[PDB]
Amino acid sequence: LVCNGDSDCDEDSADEDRCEDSERRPSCDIDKPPPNIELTGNGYNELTG
Amino acid sequence: CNFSDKEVEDCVTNRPCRSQVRCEGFVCAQTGRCVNRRLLCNGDNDCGD
Lengths: 49, 49
Fold this sequence. Notes:
The structure is cut from a larger assembly and holds chains A and B.
Chain A: H1 38-41
Chain B: E1 26-27, E2 34-35
Antiparallel strand pairs in B: 1-2
């Protein structure tokens, strides 16, 4: 995954530090996630709803 | 009342004290922000400087 051109380290993007744009592959055409997918990531408190 | 609920004096250095906490990272010259060496030549200002 290093130098995918995708930040596969979550918060750090350390897999993309000092990475040459000649080595970065065009991993995908686009990077727009579905319009609110991040909410699926969230946790839920079943008592308080 | 006068804005002097505080007052300050200078001293002789009756005793030394601990040096400022060691920075293992890079030291931002002006700010002295301790920053990680991966955050150099990053393309971002991480110092405020």
